[PDB]
């Protein structure tokens, strides 16, 4: 219902149509992340690094515990939350707190193994309880780089290297678990960020937990797999995190259409239409979509939320075959698409690029009246555009070239120029208002 043929005359050539997907129905998996390595094999060399590291780690961790206790103290046995005590909170925070309280059963079950959790010296261990996987930070580095050379190097270099490693790990961790994270009660934190505790390789975490699907990569890349912190221990220095595995559910009667832009010629100038590239047609209701937060694959578009945004009535009126309402922007740069191929036909502003056929050896020319030139079998089979030769047919109107259409007014999309345009516009409006008042 977009009248693609009329849009193609102003450089908006129909592109690839994709389906729309959104996450739903997560599955929960608990995992412990021990934040302090075990150095029982090389304790002769620790010195005072461990004390300072523990002090700094406790300083980092305590605010998280203080924030979580706010929602753990009040919630009582469904589940009733005392609104008075909480005071101020949004809906997402309330839902996250409800989930956190619901997770307390598994949190206690995991905590029952506190003695065994603290006494693990390995990168990844499996403790039977259902089984729970205990990870460790820097325990692989200590095991395979420092312990082997305990006898080759002095106990002053080992201590210094361990201190440097701990400091670097803390520096990396502070970016995520520092003062920036002030909303622990929320399930919108991606596993990629949460993996900074273990060292930055979320692949090991996901493989250990166990992912069962073929589209796992698409879920992972679009920030659709998130985790939550359900318990923090200030004594053994470990946090239990719950990972959510959702499933993509394609939405029905909804698809995203992409429009490839092209620069057309008018009044001896190259212009580009200013129209959104991605259009979300859902239930025959056109609207915009925020693509910055949405992953784009070859056959579909995946988002973790519904990003549809209202679109101004003028845009919807224009996309439905009314080119008078679509603005244009002048082109001064020399690097802008000048031709585009769709469905086998070639739409190309044929004045700027030396477009010239091959079979008959003549040249393809366009008069100043035309905006874009369409080339297909009828004109001639093979087209020699610049330095590339190319070889279909057009299923639309037969007399596409000699039609002509009205075009809209120009605009400027520079960030600074918006303010100047608004100010001058107002200046003009005020003058007209004063003139009307005078007479």
């Amino acid at each position, epitope marked *: 219902i977009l009248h693609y043929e009329k849009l193609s005359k102003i450089g908006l050539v129909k592109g690839v149509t994709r389906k729309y997907k959104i996450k739903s129905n997560p599955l929960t998996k608990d995992i412990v992340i021990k934040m302090i390595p075990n150095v029982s094999n090389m*304790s*002769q*060399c*620790t*010195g005072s690094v461990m004390e300072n590291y523990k002090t700094r780690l406790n300083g980092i961790l305590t605010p998280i515990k203080g924030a979580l206790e706010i929602y753990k103290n009040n919630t009582h046995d469904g589940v009733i939350m005392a609104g008075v005590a909480i005071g101020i909170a949004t809906a997402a925070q309330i839902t996250a707190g409800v989930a956190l309280y619901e997770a307390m059963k598994n949190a206690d079950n995991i905590n029952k193994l506190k003695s065994s959790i603290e006494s693990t010296n390995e990168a990844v261990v499996k403790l039977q309880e259902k089984t729970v996987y205990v990870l460790t930070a820097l325990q692989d580095y200590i095991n395979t780089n420092l312990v082997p050379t*305990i*006898d080759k190097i*002095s*106990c*002053k270099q080992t201590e210094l290297s361990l201190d440097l490693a701990l400091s670097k790990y803390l520096s990396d961790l502070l970016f995520v678990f520092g003062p920036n994270l002030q909303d622990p009660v929320s399930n919108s934190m991606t596993i990629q960020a949460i993996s900074q505790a273990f060292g930055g390789n979320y692949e090991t975490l996901l493989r250990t937990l166990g992912y069962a699907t073929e589209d796992f990569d698409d879920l992972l890349e679009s920030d659709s797999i998130t985790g939550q912190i359900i318990y923090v221990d200030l004594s053994s220095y470990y946090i239990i995190v719950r990972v959510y595995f959702p499933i993509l559910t394609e939405i029905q009667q909804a698809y995203i259409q992409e429009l490839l832009p092209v620069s057309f010629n008018n009044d001896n100038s190259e212009w580009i239409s200013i129209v959104p590239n991605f259009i979300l047609v859902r239930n025959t209701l056109i609207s915009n979509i925020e693509i910055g937060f949405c992953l784009i694959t070859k056959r579909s578009v995946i988002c973790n939320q519904d990003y549809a945004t209202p679109m101004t009535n003028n845009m919807r009126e224009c996309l439905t075959g009314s080119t008078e309402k679509c603005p244009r922007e002048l082109v001064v740069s020399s690097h802008v698409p000048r031709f585009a191929l769709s469905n086998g036909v070639l739409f190309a502003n044929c004045i700027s690029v030396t477009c010239q056929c091959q079979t008959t050896g003549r040249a393809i020319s366009q008069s100043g009246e035309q905006t874009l030139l369409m080339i297909d079998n009828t004109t001639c089979p093979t087209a020699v555009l610049g330095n590339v030769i190319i070889s279909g047919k057009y299923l639309g109107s037969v007399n596409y070239n000699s039609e002509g259409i009205a075009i809209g007014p120009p605009v400027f999309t520079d960030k600074v120029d918006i303010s100047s345009q608004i100010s001058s516009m107002n200046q003009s409006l005020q003058q007209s208002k004063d003139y009307i008042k005078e007479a």
Partner: antibody
Amino acid sequence: QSLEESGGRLVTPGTPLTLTCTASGFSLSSYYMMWVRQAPGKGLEWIGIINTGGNAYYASWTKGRFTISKTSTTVDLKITSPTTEDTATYFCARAVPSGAGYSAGGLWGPGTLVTVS
Amino acid sequence: LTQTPASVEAAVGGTVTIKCQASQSVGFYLSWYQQKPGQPPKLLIYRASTLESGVPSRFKGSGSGTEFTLTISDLECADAATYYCQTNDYLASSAFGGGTEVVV
């Protein structure tokens, strides 16, 4: 708790000799077992250490004339090609478990005088 | 790697200082012992600042790279015997130092 060690009678040069530490009251695999020597009226001298496993490191000044071994609940320092220089009161000590470095000598044995003819 | 304690102080009723310096840097790792005649040495200080449990509040020594010194604040008859300062940095080779005589 006391690292009682068997002594060694005077032996003619050129014959092997063996000493042992009859450790009791504690686990012998938890800590290193360093060996020290003191010639009469002279300063202490280091003659090697043994890891928890079977890996013993020796002093530079000894050309592999000693042998450090570990038994289930005892350690042994066998000597080869003894000479007049070997006479001393050998001591058996256990390194401090942590916080001091290698060969901290937290606890020491009574010592035994291995004289040489 | 090499030690050279030379104080041989013979003061009675007052503070006595013993000093030893390693040939090369040894970091903060060095232990001070005590050996009365006819008895095995007993650890007094390890890491050059820490006191082994049991020793009195005195026997406070300190220092830095290849320079260490132990000071016996409150001296009495019971504290008179040989003193040693062992380097305990390398696992491969740790060596003692020359004996010292307080001879109170």
